[PDB]
Symmetry: C3
Subunit: 321 residues, 3 copies
């Protein structure tokens, strides 16, 4: 059969041979049967979704097999052959709920390389597969081995920098997609989809399985599962919640410190400082500003050309057209 | 007498021999008289609260004394003997307002190692004892020596990374306690108390003498002096203020971009986007209006829900 | 004529010889004609605003010329002569809209060194002159060369740290002015003016051409073009709007509340209540606490001793005196 994805990885492991993270230089969506046919016998792949650890020798073998079939992947495998760290090939026959750390990391790569979009890939039960880990300037480190490494650094008059303790690394450790700006890279997780023409500013944040079509200006918080359409601006310190999935249309404008608990349609505007939820009672208004009726926000969810605000004289939530 | 605390430190110093910071690998709350008796004569400790700089030779001596008494401390001292940087032993006979940089750092360590909880230790006049400093990837640097170090890095085609200019370093430089998650480590100061099962997210922040019982999900700002009870969630960009001390009960839920200027009881809920202060007039409900009272008078009571009327903008409390 | 500014720079370049950034150890506002007269012939400077790349040999020459005239600059040039990276002298005859990357960086330095204040310098068309770049712990790197560098790091079991993808580096890479505190240095761009006695906390942010007279406590977002007067406090996650109409400024002795926001310039000693966003078109209730009249905030912009709160009971936006 035709595989969903395949990628050759270099990773890091703790003393107990558990995998902490994998790096994939060139992950492949829907690889050709030519590549699979040449690779399967050397790895010992028959079927299904596998994380197959291969040796330095197999690297060279694989590298050789793919000459004539795919040069880029061949070249990569020759570099992988030389490496100091362990190697792993992950072949995914179907888009299915992951079952290894190596598969977990592949899927996150696909998102962030833009090969797929949010919600187009299965991520069920991914948390238990991502081990909590110390992200230091010398790489991934196991939390049980941390203190000792911290002590040796200090005894040499040095410091081991620890920038995150988490189950998700930051994206720019693995990839930086084209035509994008990220002010502070700590605030974008691997799995984020950052679209072409997007600026993610310092106060901006983008979680996994989330992001922007592009172009766009993100100064606020894009939660996991949320996708923002082309041309929309998210103002400083604005929020999206983490039932319904929240999404944001094309050409929208969310104000600074505002927040949305419902999916917005195309060309919507939320006023600065305004938090609107699904159960919020809103005052709907016409061409002139006249009260049509009182509905809840969820009933106006997904609709275009809305303008939400809060009356400065009387504290009423309004929604104009 | 029985000492309050003791710890053996390796630190950094500027050209003028002033101390910028101290690292304590294994700080001790209420150390046994056995340890003290073996250590005091070699250091020259008689009484009170002292920051005693000891030499590489004394390290070995101390190391040897403690064999049979306490192995872990003995082993540590042998490593300390080899070190490149200066050493300091700080012995605290009482829990009292600090009088040296070294003692200042010890107390912060106790908090962050979870040996003590917020408000259970004296931190009066700590600011003037903590010198403002450049925190770089090669360690602590004095601000007056910074530019020169910056210039040499650049001339070699390199960059000296400067991640903070502050009187408090970030916690994970010194310790990372067990069963915790910190998305961005820049946002947790040394002195923070991060309880087991807590996740501090990117937008989360925890100052010194503050933190969480654990478990909990912190996506907001926990100010100095504030302690959050077990099971509570603090939403994205929510605030606690920096009179009354603010605290947060068990099982609470603070909404995104909300804010609390009063202590919340167990199982309280503050709605998203809502800022409630001590002088805020609130509408108490049974959802029939019972009366109108000030938020300070509702302080510390359980099972509340603070929200605002979307039709008329009235602050309520069902 | 008398020059506006001059500075000798060490920078970094990509493979195509385009300049990614410049570092200026000691930039000079209004340098004396003595310094100019000694430097101009060796560099080939006649007139106008020039970015002149000079060689390691010229460095020594320049270094020698300035002995007796200016020791500090002489000393610096002798160190620059030894350097591994390329050198550039930027001489600015007038305060004018920039025309090179090197001039762009010089002007940012002047702000951040405090030699000039926000709005006192021409920054028109600066964006296209600042190339988007990967800021890593080994320096500036071109985005087109990134992936390869990332790969080599990983093959050696290491990690290349990438802390920002942006057209502006963070300030503390170039300077840290005296008597200041910056909790998180990622949140202050080069060009920011941080005044003496200021504390910029973790949630605080200061963009280019922006900042504080000093002293002050900044726990919120100071947008580009915004200047905050002496003694003011900006509370946690508070906002100021962007010019990118009126320029927003903040007076002396003001107090902005946590999560609040200002879309108008505040006068001296103004107070904005926590959680309150006030814009130019916001209808406000002016008070004496008896209602005097109802005006639009823009009519109260730049005036002192106000108190903008929000009535808890009926949500009316008030302004007491
Ligand atoms: N409910 C929120 C916050 C949880 C993120 C924590 C995590 O994924 O580690 C959201 O969906 O963003
Ligand atoms: N709205 C913010 C930042 C705009 C984007 C910054 C940039 O593009 O460099 C301000 O005006 O301060």
């Amino acid at each position: 059969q035709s595989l969903f994805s395949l990628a050759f990885g270099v990773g890091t492991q703790n003393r107990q041979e558990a995998w902490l993270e994998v790096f994939y230089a060139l992950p492949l969506l829907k690889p050709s049967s030519e590549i699979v046919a040449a690779v399967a016998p050397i790895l010992g792949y028959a079927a299904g979704n596998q994380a197959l650890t291969f040796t330095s020798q197999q690297a060279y073998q694989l590298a050789d097999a793919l000459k004539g079939i795919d040069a880029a992947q061949s070249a990569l495998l020759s570099r992988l052959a030389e490496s100091q760290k362990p190697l792993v090939a992950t072949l995914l026959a179907e888009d299915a709920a992951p079952s290894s750390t190596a598969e977990a990391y592949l899927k996150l790569h696909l998102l962030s390389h833009r090969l797929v979009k949010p919600h187009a890939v299965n991520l069920s039960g991914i948390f238990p597969l991502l081990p909590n880990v110390a992200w230091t300037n010398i790489g991934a480190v196991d939390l049980a081995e941390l203190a000792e490494l911290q002590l040796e650094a200090r005894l040499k008059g040095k410091l081991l920098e620890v920038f995150s303790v988490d189950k998700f690394p930051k994206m720019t450790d693995y990839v930086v997609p084209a035509g994008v700006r990220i002010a502070d890279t700590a605030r974008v997780r691997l799995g984020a989809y950052i679209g072409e023409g997007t600026t993610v500013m310092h106060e901006g944040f983008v979680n996994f399985n989330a992001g922007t079509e592009g172009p766009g200006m993100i100064e606020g918080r894009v939660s996991a599962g949320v996708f923002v359409g082309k041309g929309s601006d998210l103002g400083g310190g604005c929020s999206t919640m983490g039932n319904i999935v929240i999404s944001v249309g094309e050409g929208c404008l969310i104000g600074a410190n505002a927040g949305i608990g419902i999916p917005l349609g195309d060309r919507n505007i939320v006023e600065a400082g305004l938090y609107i939820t699904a159960g919020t009672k809103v005052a709907l208004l016409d061409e002139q500003n006249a009260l049509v009726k009182v509905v809840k926000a969820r009933d106006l969810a997904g609709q275009p050309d809305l303008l939400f605000r809060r009356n400065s004289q009387n504290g009423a939530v309004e929604c104009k057209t």
